Amino acid sequence: SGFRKMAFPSGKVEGCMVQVTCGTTTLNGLWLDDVVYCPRHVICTSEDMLNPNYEDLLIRKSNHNFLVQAGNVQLRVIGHSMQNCVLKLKVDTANPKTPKYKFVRIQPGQTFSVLACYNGSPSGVYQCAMRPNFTIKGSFLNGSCGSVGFNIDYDCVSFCYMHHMELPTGVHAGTDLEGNFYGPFVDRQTAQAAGTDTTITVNVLAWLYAAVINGDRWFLNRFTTTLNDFNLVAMKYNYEPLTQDHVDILGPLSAQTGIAVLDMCASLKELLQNGMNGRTILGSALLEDEFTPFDVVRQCSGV
Amino acid sequence: SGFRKMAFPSGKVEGCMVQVTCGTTTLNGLWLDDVVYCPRHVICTSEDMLNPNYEDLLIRKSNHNFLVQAGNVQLRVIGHSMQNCVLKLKVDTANPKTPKYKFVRIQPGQTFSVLACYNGSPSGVYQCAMRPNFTIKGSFLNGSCGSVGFNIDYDCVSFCYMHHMELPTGVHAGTDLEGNFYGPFVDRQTAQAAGTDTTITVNVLAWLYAAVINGDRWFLNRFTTTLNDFNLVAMKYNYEPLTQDHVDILGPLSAQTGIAVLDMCASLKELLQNGMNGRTILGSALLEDEFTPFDVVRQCS
Numbered sequence: 188s189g190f191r192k193m194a195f196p197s198g199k200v201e202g203c204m205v206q207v208t209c210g211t212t213t214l215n216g217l218w219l220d221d222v223v224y225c226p227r228h229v230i231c232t233s234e235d236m237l238n239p240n241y242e243d244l245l246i247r248k249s250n251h252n253f254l255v256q257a258g259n260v261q262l263r264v265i266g267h268s269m270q271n272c273v274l275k276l277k278v279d280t281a282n283p284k285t286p287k288y289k290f291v292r293i294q295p296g297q298t299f300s301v302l303a304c305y306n307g308s309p310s311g312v313y314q315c316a317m318r319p320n321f322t323i324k325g326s327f328l329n330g331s332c333g334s335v336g337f338n339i340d341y342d343c344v345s346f347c348y349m350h351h352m353e354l355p356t357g358v359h360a361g362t363d364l365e366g367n368f369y370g371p372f373v374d375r376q377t378a379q380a381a382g383t384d385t386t387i388t389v390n391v392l393a394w395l396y397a398a399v400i401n402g403d404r405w406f407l408n409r410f411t412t413t414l415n416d417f418n419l420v421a422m423k424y425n426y427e428p429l430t431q432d433h434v435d436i437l438g439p440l441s442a443q444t445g446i447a448v449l450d451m452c453a454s455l456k457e458l459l460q461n462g463m464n465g466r467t468i469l470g471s472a473l474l475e476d477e478f479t480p481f482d483v484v485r486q487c488s489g490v
Numbered sequence: 491s492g493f494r495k496m497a498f499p500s501g502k503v504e505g506c507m508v509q510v511t512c513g514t515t516t517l518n519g520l521w522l523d524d525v526v527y528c529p530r531h532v533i534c535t536s537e538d539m540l541n542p543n544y545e546d547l548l549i550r551k552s553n554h555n556f557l558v559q560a561g562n563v564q565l566r567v568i569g570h571s572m573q574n575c576v577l578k579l580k581v582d583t584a585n586p587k588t589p590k591y592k593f594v595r596i597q598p599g600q601t602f603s604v605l606a607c608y609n610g611s612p613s614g615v616y617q618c619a620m621r622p623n624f625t626i627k628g629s630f631l632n633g634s635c636g637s638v639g640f641n642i643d644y645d646c647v648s649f650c651y652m653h654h655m656e657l658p659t660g661v662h663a664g665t666d667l668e669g670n671f672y673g674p675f676v677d678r679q680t681a682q683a684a685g686t687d688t689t690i691t692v693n694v695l696a697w698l699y700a701a702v703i704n705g706d707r708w709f710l711n712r713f714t715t716t717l718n719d720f721n722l723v724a725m726k727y728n729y730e731p732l733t734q735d736h737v738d739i740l741g742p743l744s745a746q747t748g749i750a751v752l753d754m755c756a757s758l759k760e761l762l763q764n765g766m767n768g769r770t771i772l773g774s775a776l777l778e779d780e781f782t783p784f785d786v787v788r789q790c791s
């Protein structure tokens with residue numbers, strides 16, 4: 188037993204990471220088959236960054252403008268195309284360590300693993316959630332751009348995130364691997380801010396179940412409530428609405444535990460008004476919301 | 491730029507993980523060159539869990555009794571010896587994915603990554619600290635024995651933990667890769683329990699320095715303290731003694747931020763007195779003790 192924030196093993200993705208240089212800018216790329224994927228802003232100089240014309244910038248560039256390094260080996264570029272905010276650099280050699288993979292786009296509330304990289308070298312791995320305001324709470328310094336987020340299912344890597352920027356409150360924004368942004372952000376130096384964050388209700392409930400499953404039970408009670416009464420207090424504390432689908436997805440654990448979701452809701456209710464005030468659940472003095480139901484089950488199962 | 495509990499990239503370890511079966515019992519092992527390393531209790535039943543005589547149990551085994559499998563390839567065992575609580579199987583094939591590696595014994599306070607595995611197949615990776623009472627707070631189910639903890643420095647993998655048991659408080663215990671336990675635990679099913687735990691003071695200070703680096707100063711104060719007055723207070727909240735070695739180690743973080751170690755000790759002292767009062771520090775509502783000074787420097791610069 189025990190309960191921890193856990194990333195997927197990262198080896199399948201470590202082998203796809205490369206370095207990409209265009210002029211003074213260096214950042215990371217993802218090498219799958221014979222294409223390297225990286226952020227389109229690798230083509231911008233500092234001056235261009237304030238108001239860039241990407242189609243114009245790119246037309247001016249040729250293959251020779253892009254230096255791609257895998258370890259010490261040098262990949263040569265035979266083609267270049269833009270898709271949305273991502274650049275696709277065709278290269279001579281297909282990646283021998285290419286895994287089974289697809290590109291997918293994730294919903295707010297869903298989690299995934301980030302492999303942080305610098306100069307094409309993986310530095311660390313951690314779990315994040317795509318927040319309701321479309322940011323992630325990561326850890327990223329200069330050179331991190333191009334790092335990816337992913338899930339693993341059997342042998343198949345599902346890539347969902349490529350890193351592009353930092354926002355004023357120390358939170359992070361990027362794209363799917365077809366170059367579409369998560370959230371209302373643009374790849375330019377301009378005044379941007381995250382919207383008001385909100386708490387992922389269904390994830391907090393899943394985590395209260397994990398607490399119960401692991402012997403922690405000093406928040407339970409005897410009282411059911413209603414979606415409507417609940418949602419009204421949810422609204423008051425900046426919690427997402429809880430839908431009937433949420434109540435369904437939590438079904439396994441209501442069963443496994445003997446505790447009704449709306450029971451759990453009155454527990455949460457009480458925690459919302461009273462405060463935590465330094466007292467703890469699964470080692471936390473705040474209500475955690477970056478574990479999904481599937482995450483809680485995946486980890487109390489052994490998959 | 492943010493701050494997260496961050497594991498090492500697990501790929502170098504993933505390619506060494508295998509499964510070891512003996513009778514009814516299956517767990518994980520670690521394949522480096524021509525040796526598979528696993529917990530010696532792979533050769534026990536449940537019958538034999540209370541007072542196993544491992545020397546007696548091993549003598550009665552032949553090589554062919556150990557089923558070792560790396561993915562779909564069955565490896566052939568050609569020899570075996572026991573070293574402390576670890577069993578070393580000699581196999582007829584060297585592991586081609588073997589990395590640069592060393593075996594080190596860590597001290598309490600130190601951190602590392604765990605690769606949780608089942609049936610020779612990795613399931614997740616997370617960071618842990620060796621607690622002062624010689625346990626870790628992990629996530630381990632039936633089948634996880636033989637999972638290992640490690641650090642990575644350049645291309646060199648430092649193996650420092652192999653997983654053996656769960657203890658009544660729901661915390662975990664194991665050995666180094668030479669088979670010696672951390673703590674006064676033993677590989678048998680008697681009643682044994684962890685000593686009372688304490689907070690890793692030097693790591694909490696490093697984390698406060700990390701909050702300052704990331705642009706957050708609300709918890710600082712205008713006071714200072716002697717080293718000795720600090721420890722007399724801290725012990726009252728079950729914090730580990732801070733030593734002169736600890737102070738020397740926080741030197742670099744002090745220089746970068748311009749906060750003297752003993753000034754930051756005064757802040758901590760007050761945070762223990764007051765609590766957070768609704769605020770948080772690097773996203774936490776508690777004082778966090780599983781980041782080391784080396785870890786803070788790694789991830790901030």
Ligand SMILES: *[C@](O)(C(=O)NCc1ccccc1)[C@H](C[C@@H]1CCNC1=O)NC(=O)[C@H](CC1CC1)n1cccc(NC(=O)OC(C)(C)C)c1=O
Nearest residue numbers: 213214327328329330331332351352353354355374375376
């Ligand atoms: C990215 O492009 C990257 O890693 N580039 C390579 C590189 C950059 C700097 C020096 C050497 C090499 C970064 C990743 C950033 C850096 C710090 N933390 C991160 O997550 N992305 C940007 O720098 C991004 C550029 C893309 C077009 C949108 N950018 C540009 C300008 C400003 C900001 N952020 C910002 O002003 O936020 C605050 C919080 C005010 C610092 C930005 O992210």
Ligand SMILES: *[C@](O)(C(=O)NCc1ccccc1)[C@H](C[C@@H]1CCNC1=O)NC(=O)[C@H](CC1CC1)n1cccc(NC(=O)OC(C)(C)C)c1=O
Nearest residue numbers: 188531630631632633634635654655656657658677678679
């Ligand atoms: C380890 O042997 C393992 O993973 N073995 C393979 C396996 C076991 C059971 C079923 C199928 C396959 C486990 C790891 C444990 C199990 C749950 N979480 C863990 O970290 N180690 C043991 O079961 C261990 C072996 C003994 C030291 C040599 N063991 C045996 C007996 C009792 C306990 N602990 C115990 O009593 O648990 C509490 C928490 C008190 C209920 C124990 O760890």
